[PDB]
Amino acid sequence: PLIKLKNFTELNSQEIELIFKWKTKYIDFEEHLRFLKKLHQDSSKKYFLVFQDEQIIGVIDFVNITTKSCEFGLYAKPNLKGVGQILMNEIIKYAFESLKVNTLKAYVFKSNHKALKLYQQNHFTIYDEDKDFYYVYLKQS
What we know:
Layout: E1 3-7, H1 13-21, H2 26-41, E2 46-52, E3 55-63, E4 69-76, H3 84-99, E5 103-109, H4 113-121, E6 125-129, E7 133-139
Parallel strand pairs: 4-5
Antiparallel strand pairs: 1-2, 2-3, 3-4, 5-7, 6-7
C-alpha cells in the first residue's frame, strides 16, 4: 500500500519531536510523553501518523470513539499541498471499516474555510453552529 498508518503509541523520539514542532525543552518533551502514555490507556482516542511512500504527510485523530460514532481531526504536514484529500480518505476508511462507526463528526472554527470546503467535498453536512464552531457530520447509513 502507498498509504500507511503508524499509531502514536508506537512513535519514536525523532517523530515525536518533528510533529509537535508543526532543541526541545525538557518540559515540552515530558508533556509530549505524558500525552503518549495517556493514549496507551485510552480506548476512546486514537492518533495516527500517516505516511505516503515512507514519507510523513500528516496526522489524523479520532476522539470520543463509541460503538456508533466518533469525532475526528486532521493536520497536514505544514509544507505540503494536496494531501488533505488523502488524509480524508484515510479517516473515512478507518472510521467506517475499522472502528465500524455509523456517524463521523467534526467541529471546525467558522473561519477555517479550507477545512469546511474539504469536508463539504467529502459529503459532510453542517448540522449545528455555536459562537465558535460549525459542527459537521457524515453517516455511512
